[PDB]
Each structure stands twice: as structure tokens, then as C-alpha cells.
Amino acid sequence: GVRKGWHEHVTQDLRSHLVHKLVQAIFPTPDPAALKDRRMENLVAYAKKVEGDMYESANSRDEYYHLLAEKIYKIQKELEEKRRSRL
């Protein structure tokens, strides 16, 4: 028996845009040229690996989103006060 029965609700468009939106909060970049630089490919590959691990860690689409958004919350709001507190 396996509780996972939610993969059929997902789309390739959702997968693509959620990987993209993961990257936007993992590192917002200094300027839009920094999204195109070769070092951002490491950030992008890390975001792809995280997306797949959070997907595999979930028995529902809601739990998958919750796991994505909690790790996004950590990565964004930890650095926003450890490195950007003065805003």
C-alpha cells in the first residue's frame, strides 16, 4: 500500500514555474543580469534538486507545496535578518 495518489494533478507548466519561483526566493539576485551569469546555474541546479526532494517527501500536493514553501521561508527570511536586517 502507498498513500501517494496526487501526481496526476500536477502539470509540466506547474513544475517549470514552481522551480523558477523557488529560485526567485532562494536568491532574488542583485540585478537581472545576475540571473544569466554562469554561477546562478549552481543555485538553479540546487533549486531543481530541492524541488524533487520536497516532491518525493510528500503524500499529497498540499504537503508538497507546504514543504517547498517552508524551506523557501527559511532560506529567504533567515538571510533577510542575518544579512539584510537594515532593509
Partner: peptide, 25 residues
């Protein structure tokens, strides 16, 4: 900190509504 927290939490979970909606239910 609250507006940007709800903003971050919503920013991901809105994507399925942006791409394929919820009017089917």
C-alpha cells in the same frame, strides 16, 4: 514581519490557480 510572510506563503500556492484555476469545484 507579517505582510511579506503571507506574501511569500501565498506566492507559491497561487501558481496552480494562475495556470489551471479552481472553477471546476
Amino acid at each position: 514581519k507579517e505582510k511579506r510572510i503571507k506574501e511569500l506563503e501565498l506566492l507559491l500556492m497561487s501558481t496552480e490557480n494562475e495556470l489551471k484555476g479552481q472553477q471546476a469545484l
